[PDB]
Design a binder for this molecule. Structure first.
Ligand SMILES: NC(=O)c1ccc[n+]([C@@H]2O[C@H](COP(=O)([O-])OP(=O)(O)OC[C@H]3O[C@@H](n4cnc5c(N)ncnc54)[C@H](OP(=O)(O)O)[C@@H]3O)[C@@H](O)[C@H]2O)c1
Ligand SMILES: NC(=O)c1ccc[n+]([C@@H]2O[C@H](COP(=O)([O-])OP(=O)(O)OC[C@H]3O[C@@H](n4cnc5c(N)ncnc54)[C@H](OP(=O)(O)O)[C@@H]3O)[C@@H](O)[C@H]2O)c1
Lengths: 382, 384
């Protein structure tokens, strides 16, 4: 059928001629024991840029290797768009969260022939998980691929906030020194209290990583961890997120976006956070109330917020977070480092393979199949 | 005795009335057993700006109860310096490496009653230690004080380079998205080889901190860590740094500045390093040929460099490290975060007590005493 794939604009220097490196580490196995994607053939050197229009997830050889139709495009907005154009007769839709072709109920209505909305990466929140059920449609996402990538992003975005990196940097770039104005905001993270919403692949990664920084490790999930996990890391479990946000000076959000978590960090929850506390949100923007976050920083109740997730995506030029005080922001770039691109593209292939050769699709990669939250969907999403 | 303490400009918008936090952790022990400072008292709230002029490290009430004179300036360049002015009769001098009072042989010649050249923080390399040995002077830093501050500042820098943070936070501020532009240089550190040049308090810190990133861990040093530490961290020692930099995707430099480390990283050394390697230097700038860094950087042989330390500090505005491609530089700062100031301005104090009281100064604190390298200094530093 028509496979349709929404990928991001190429670099403004055009698709990369050469890269900064000759290769990247080979990664085969994850922490919880899960294996890295296992496609039979890949048609790209890992470490290459697969996630833009030109990269095309190195898929064009395999898909027009059964002479299927394979369209690629960054144009994805409103009903005149290239995406909206090819949408109705498409059977497999592929997009990445970094550049998400959203699939609400009406965009689901128009897609007459859609059988598999396939998230290249993690978090299928851009997809109306209910509607999907109504139309029998199947939804799968490359679970694990880029969780370690994100974890590195978060930790980094923590130290950048607590130590006030970006600003001090902003000085030295423009000729200055200004030490004194640098370290008025600069605290060690050491012996602070730090809190992960969720302790899934990311939240557990982040914890394992902050532990050697001699901080006191707290966390909310809906089920506890093992004892030997909780002891080896030396955690402090919290039933309420309320509970946790009172004691923690740093909170990392690391939970999926579904209606439980919608606006969890609204002005409501911001109350109980300690003055000068910090939020790293690498999970999904809509877990925070945008206009709440802003104020609590402007107000000064929050020392800082940083994150790579926004809403919508792209976020509008005028999105307050961008310019907001002490923002440690980036575009949505953690899941799609070259290192992680390697894995979610593989998986993207793997998942197409089993679908095209009739064979099954890993439990782990499946969010929705056959009208119910199955596999990862059942444990993580609502 | 006259005391002569050199501090740095207060914030352009005045010494601050309030700070966005109301307390900081209570660090009392260190990861080697060593105790934190043990002063008798303080004249500051742990977590106020102390290394600023107006901070006076909470001393101006101690020294004058004891009835000694206390000078404080951020003017130390030229002959004009208020510093060189009070230098001669200065019985005790204190500076912080962030705004260091450089004590060349000229200055140590023209200092006539100095008995104690004291480093606020760590890093007594703004001082000729030979001049200090001959002039019979005693020298000390606050060993431990801010080792952990730095160890974090590095790691953040490692991640920041390897993932292309600033470039991409630039794109955030300038209302773009341009993902391909962010990630075309962005990598995960997971899997890479990382090496620290020294494996001191700091270098060791970094090793422990980096370990759970599943990187491979290399290090050079003149002596080795123990069998226990080399096991639990999966450390690879090298006997030539040349052999370390060859395999390492990332090098952090955590060595003192002294003759063996001066321009360790020349163009010769830098050459050996992998294509697209990264350096982090949260130690002392002059361990790398400033000029050769920039060559390597521009030529895409080194994918980046990051560090707070420079030479000189403070530094020219057209220092090419400020503008070179893909830098992750801060002004000298890692060690004078507020959390660490509260420790070096307590060591600062504790030692002044051990001088006027006439008790042994803590051997860990001591660089030069008795006309020779001793303490930290005997194990860490060296002289021609
Ligand atoms: N580039 C990026 O920024 C990027 C990349 C990848 C992923 N992400 C986001 O991060 C999310 C986390 O993925 P992951 O790597 O952690 O995989 P995961 O193993 O599926 O983690 C999800 C975790 O969320 C917990 N959870 C679900 N609903 C919750 C709720 N209402 N409150 C608290 N915890 C809840 C689940 O445990 P319980 O069921 O026991 O609560 C589970 O441990 C993804 O879904 C995605 O939205 C962002
Ligand atoms: N703001 C900042 O960025 C900041 C803050 C504080 C300190 N620093 C710098 O970091 C330095 C590290 O000292 P520290 O107090 O962190 O810990 P430390 O224990 O004082 O550091 C000394 C370590 O460096 C090693 N070392 C000494 N000379 C060496 C050489 N020539 N080649 C290789 N290794 C050598 C020593 O081991 P061996 O005996 O085996 O050589 C020892 O492991 C300070 O002296 C200072 O220069 C920077």
């Amino acid at each position: 059928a028509k496979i349709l794939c929404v990928l991001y604009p190429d670099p403004v220097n055009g698709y990369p001629k050469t890269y900064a490196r000759d290769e990247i580490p080979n990664i085969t196995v994850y922490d919880n024991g899960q294996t890295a994607p296992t496609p039979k053939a890949i048609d790209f050197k890992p470490g290459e840029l697969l996630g833009s229009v030109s990269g095309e997830l190195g898929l064009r050889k395999y898909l027009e290797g059964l002479g299927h139709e394979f369209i690629v495009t960054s144009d994805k907005e409103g009903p005149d768009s290239e995406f909206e154009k090819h949408l109705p007769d498409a059977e497999i839709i592929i997009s990445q969260p970094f550049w998400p072709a959203y699939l609400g109920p009406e965009r689901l209505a128009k897609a007459k022939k859609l059988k598999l909305a396939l998230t290249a990466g993690i978090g299928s929140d851009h997809v109306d998980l209910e509607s999907a059920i109504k139309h029998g449609v199947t939804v799968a996402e490359v679970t694990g691929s880029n969780s370690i990538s994100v974890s590195e992003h978060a930790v980094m975005m923590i130290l950048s906030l607590v130590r006030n990196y970006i600003p001090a940097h902003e000085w030295a770039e423009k000729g200055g020194w200004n030490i004194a104005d640098c370290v008025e905001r600069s605290y060690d993270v050491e012996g602070m209290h730090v809190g992960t919403v969720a302790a899934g692949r990311i939240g557990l990664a982040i914890l394992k990583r902050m532990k050697p920084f001699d901080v006191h490790l707290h966390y909310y999930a809906r089920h506890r961890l093992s004892k030997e996990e909780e002891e080896e890391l030396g955690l402090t479990f919290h039933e309420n997120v309320e509970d946790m946000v009172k004691v923690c000076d740093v909170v990392t959000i690391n939970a999926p976006l579904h209606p439980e978590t919608h606006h969890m960090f609204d002005e409501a929850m911001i109350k109980k956070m300690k003055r000068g506390a910090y939020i790293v949100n690498t999970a999904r923007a809509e877990i925070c109330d945008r206009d709440a976050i802003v104020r609590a920083v402007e107000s000064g109740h929050l020392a800082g917020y940083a994150g790579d997730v926004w809403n919508p995506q792209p976020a509008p030029a005028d999105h307050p977070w961008r310019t907001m005080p002490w923002n440690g922001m980036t575009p949505h770039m953690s899941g799609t480092s070259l290192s992680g691109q390697a894995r979610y593209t593989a998986g993207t292939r793997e998942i197409l393979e089993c679908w095209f050769e009739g064979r099954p699709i890993r439990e782990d990669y499946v969010i929705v199949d056959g009208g119910k939250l199955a596999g990862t969907g059942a444990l993580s999403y609502t």
